[model samples]
Target chain A: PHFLILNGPNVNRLGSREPEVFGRQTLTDIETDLFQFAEALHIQLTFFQSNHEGDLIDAIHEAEEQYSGIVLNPGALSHYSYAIRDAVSSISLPVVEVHLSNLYAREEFRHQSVIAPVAKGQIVGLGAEGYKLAVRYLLSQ
Target chain B: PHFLILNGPNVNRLGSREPEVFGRQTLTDIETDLFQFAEALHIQLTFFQSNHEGDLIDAIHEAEEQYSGIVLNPGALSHYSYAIRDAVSSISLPVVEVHLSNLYAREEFRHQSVIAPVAKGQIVGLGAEGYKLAVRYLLSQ
Candidate 1:
């Protein structure tokens, strides 16, 4: 019934970071869109964004008791974030990884994901719509 | 060195068919963008798209003689087109698979790619930018 949207490092600068890579919408705009989408679907949603790994881990710990599922955009951390992967696994909540850009299409480093091994599914390169799809899929499960 | 930008089945309707999945740019718009990007990098590029499976195979056959490498978006063909996979393997050209949407995050059927096994690398879920990254990576190699 409840979903947590968790974002990681430098994601707050999505609109300004590299429009060519990430696109032109601010993090707030994306979250707002997801909120509106969740409302239409009759689902409760909570959002959290942080540039710190510990903060993200703490958020996951906090969500364990309340949320039904988690949609995470671990940003650059996706490549080598075992701690975050462990956090998602630790919570026992279904987690979906969403990305505005396709990591496999980027630098060789981005191609390797430490999260996909743990995620229920991954939605990449769908821009803002990825969040909506992740929410829908999680809800369906 | 020349590069082949090859597309397969249903990709011809990219922008007009599924704006949500493929974005608002027409297939031509994507080609134009790739053209300019290739020009800037001084890479000779050729674009090809076909709704027919055999036509795509023929294009790959032709590419073997003319191109240095290939940037392929086998569209739905990536899932079950063993012929396309064989063509890539037959040519020995560095081939990269591109997808407008993240195939892995979608249905289970989309996750099994016959072509990926033979591809030099894959760049899925990046939309049109996947082509650019493929081009850059190929040239760098």
Candidate 2:
């Protein structure tokens, strides 16, 4: 089985964007760790990151054919991007939404994920660990 | 006979922020126009603009005692500020949510207003005129 880790918007700046809120792990660092985890599990893992909403939508649409499941962290887009929400809904693949920070404890704007209602599940506030958890859930299913 | 026009966050930069989407009228300019409109209607209109969410929440709480109704443009906070939503819901006064831009037509993030479900009504895409329209609606009620 194969899984895709999808990241959106300011996630590329994760390690440096807000060290206090999002922690100090860059996307490459997180991806590197996941690669090792996937290798041990003997499953193919693909990583895709984009700041554009449409590009992420396109990737999710294409992932239906290429990956077994998805681990997604849409960053700020999780709060209000209904287009992404709709994209997630249109796909049948299991999507585990992960966040580096606890959205409910953050700003009121970050509290509600428009994507969560349509996602398979969500993981938050555990930093890079959230991604690992999401992957484990996806691979287990 | 008394109304409060509450502007939040980026509303302070209206005339300069994104004139094409939000219009070229400054908050003061809209306030001035509404002042004349209020004068003609023989009602008192007080204008308040704040970038801080807590300040706006405080203002809404205080308006319940001093004002008959409120015309609120919560800016980007409208989409995800459940704190503001709770404040509006807790108050007995009528709150008319106004947006210079048509939220439905803009970026997907701007589409859902957490403030709308509890507001008296909403006016959108009407530019500075939306403020006057909201004030009129509040005064008529």
Candidate 3:
């Protein structure tokens, strides 16, 4: 199986942003970890992260041609970007929303995600495990 | 017909904050104008504002019993609140999201609304006219 893992906004700064809140793990670490597990699962994973919404939007639009499924952590856009959500719904790929933090228990602003409704399902507050779980869910489907 | 006018987060500061950006109109001006328009339409409108996410969530929860539809401007929380989006989805009442600014035309962060998919429709960047249009959209339904 082939999968696309996309991260958005400030997510590229995961390691330096907050230790207790977002966890000390960096995006690179999560990507490396997922890769380590992907081979055993026999899944091909492609990872991308961007500070620009347009770039992320373009990637999803392209993935319709290149990927079987997507695992997305849309960072701050998860709360506000309808354009991104629309992009996700525009395609048929089974996309899972991932977040390293437990959204509901965090800052009031962090709790709501615009991405969840159109997503296949959401895995949040679970850290890097969230990515692994999303991959597994998409694979199972 | 009846409507709930719900405001979230820093929306209370609308009149004073960023005169060039959000415009010089106070939240009160918009509410009073909406009230006047509501009278002409024979619709009773209830208004509520909160800085708390849980309070907005509670307001929307109770709206299932009290209002025919909701016209919400979730302010800063609109950028990142999944909790609010879920609440909107949970209720049967129709919701229309309104914005004074053209999100896409502004900052990348402002461009997406976690609220749009669940909303019946959106009227944005038309200044206070967005609210009037939202009322028309709901009443027509």
Candidate 4:
């Protein structure tokens, strides 16, 4: 399925920003790996990462014209940004929310997701494998 | 303008739930004040309260077919429910989110609101008067 892999707010600084919490893969490394997997699965995939909330929302709106589904990692914005959740819901395509770390296992602030219920499903604590697993689910649907 | 004043999870137990935090006014008492004010303004207002997530989402969806705007107080669900946020966004009318207590002054988990950004604006720490503030904004729009 054609999909948008959207990351938000500080996700672009993933590796360097949180070495103690996250694994060694930078944002670019994961994007490259996901591209390879996308090619093998024969689906069009557009990668997007933004530090701004409005930019990310705009991309989700634009994706309706180009993609069938979405795999979203909304960063800390998932802790509060309803605009992102609304953008995901505004579209009819399926969206799978992902997390690099198990949020409930972390801080009180991270334990909840603002995007999970509106998403088709959620992948958490699996690192970058979350994207591959999400894409597979997308394909079956 | 007509309005939907929606309250979410655990809001059913408003007065007994936290006397000090919310004051002596029960949920019914607050609704009484809202209606009194709505009548003064000569606007129709529909009030709804639910402990269930899907029920609130369904109400929001239906509100679109009948109401003008909404004044939503999402209780603890405001900390996590994206489906609620999405439901508000899927509709065209303006929404104003409210909180009886200052979230940031309470639990660390309560500090962020999942529904705040997509909403027309937010009212916090202002007691039930928040709805009146929202109603005026809704009318101007």
Candidate 5:
């Protein structure tokens, strides 16, 4: 199965921003790890990252035609961005939401994920492992 | 006409935290201004604030039968909180979303409002005046 992995705003700055909170693992590090994992599973993987909501929405829309499912870490957009929520809900493809941080333990704003309600499932606070787990679940389905 | 002014999460700390950003105007100050505005318009108003999403959802649900409309500054919850967004959409009464700051100018997360999609209208970047304008629009409706 082919899958698309999407990352949203500020996630591109992951490793450098807050080493204490987000960890020192760069975005490149996570993607590289996922590539190795995908080779073992014998599944194809595609990745995209953007700071713009419109671009992310476009990527999700395009994924419906090209990918089996999606693994999304919507960064700050996870909190608001109903535009993305609508995009996720509009597609038939199953989406698994993942977060690097335990949002509930952080700021009150981070406690909720607007995307979660429309998503197929969610994994959080597990670092880059969340992405691997999301991929595994999609393949199982 | 009767209106409910609802605030969510960390808004209670309005006057104290980041006074330069959020302004030194307390929630009490805004509510007090609304009360006077309501009296002149010959309308009744109710006010509620909570840091919890459940309580905010409950308040929105209860307002359906009790109030003509709502003026909501959902604070950080405006960025996420689909539960509250669902509540606002479920209610028949018009909701006017307000924000003290120009959310687009703040952190990237603050730009999109999940609640605004279902709200009657929105006023932002005008400080305490946004509340007053929201009340006026609801009354006009």
Candidate 6:
């Protein structure tokens, strides 16, 4: 089965931005690790990170035709991205929302997530490992 | 006022078991970081990690009189620990659920969380720093 790991907005700067809050690994480092992990499990993995909402929407739409499931880190967009939420709902793929940091414990604004209602599930506060867990869960399903 | 950061099950081995998933930081490392962050903000912080469900329940009961709020990483308990859920609901202080890894993308068993509904909010997939975010949010509230 194939899985898509989609990242949205500002995630590309992971390792460099607030190493204390977001951690010290780059998005590439996480992708490399996930790819290796996927290979071990014999699953095809596709990764895409975009700063644009429309691009992210396009990616989700595209994944519906090919991938079994999707793991997404909508980044700052999780707070109020109704468009992204709708896109995931429309695709009918099993989608999981990921966060490099715990949003509920941050600013009150960050605590509100529109994505969780639409996602199959959510993984937050675990950093890059969340992607691996998501992959494992997807594999089990 | 004091804040309690309570972790449930298998979290003590954070750094060693899955450095890629949980990060290379130990529980103590995370505690130290939280202390520094709290000190800067003038908030008092306490730490707790437990494997037993009842122990966590007792801790929540105790916190009602001792602390202003709580930052919780319910570990595996988050998914189906209705006992813990009830315990948190009994308290008046704000409670936040933190996960070092995202649960939604994982197996169906891990996808359903009993704690999310009871928590003032939840932060998942962020790893260790999630505690800091939870603490900050509690302090602000």
Question: Per-candidate TM vs. native?
Answer: 0.55, 0.53, 0.52, 0.53, 0.52, 0.56
- Highest TM-score: which candidate? 6
Output the worst ten-in-a-row residue range by lDDT, candidate 4 chain A: A10-19
lDDT of 1 by residue, A1-141 (tens): 999999999888888777766778999998788788888999999999899999999998889889999889989999898998888778788888877775545677775567765666565555666677667667756
Task: List DockQ for all candidates.
Answer: 0.05, 0.04, 0.05, 0.02, 0.04, 0.08
Tens-place lDDT digits, model 5, residues B1-141: 889999988888887677667778898887888888888989999999988665776687678778999999888888766657656765688999988977888899888887788788789898888888888888788
Candidate 1 interface RMSD value: 8.7
| Least well predicted 10-residue stretch by lDDT in candidate 3 chain A | A9-18
lDDT of each: 0.78, 0.83, 0.82, 0.81, 0.84, 0.79
Residues B24-127 of candidate 6 have per-residue lDDT tens digits of 88888988888888899887998999999999999999999999999888889987898999999899988888876655445557655677666666666656
Greater-lDDT candidate between 2 and 6: 2
Best by lDDT: 5
Summarize candidate 3's per-residue lDDT along B71-114 as a digit string, tens digits: 89888777767657766765789998888877778889888877
Which predicted model would earn the best DockQ?
A: 6
Which residue pairs clash in candidate 4? none
Tell me the tens digit of each residue's lDDT in model 2 across A1-141. 999999876566566455787787888988899999889888889998865567789999999998989999876778767988999999999999998887778666778788999899898889899988888888779
Model 6: per-residue Cα lDDT at residue A33: 88
When candidate 3 is compared with the true two-chain complex, its DockQ is 0.05
lDDT of 4 by residue, A1-141 (tens): 678899875565566544556678888999999999999988888898765567778988888888888899877778777878898889888989998877787767678777888889898899889999999999999
lDDT of 6 at A55: 98
lDDT of 5 at A135: 97
The pairs that clash in candidate 2 are none
lDDT of 4 by residue, B28-137 (tens): 98889988998998999988987866567667767777998989988998887654664565567788999887677898999887778778889988887887898899
lDDT of 6 by residue, A1-141 (tens): 999999999999888878757878998899898889889999899999999999999999988889999989988899889999889889878887877675544676775567776676566665576677677667755
Docking class of 4: incorrect
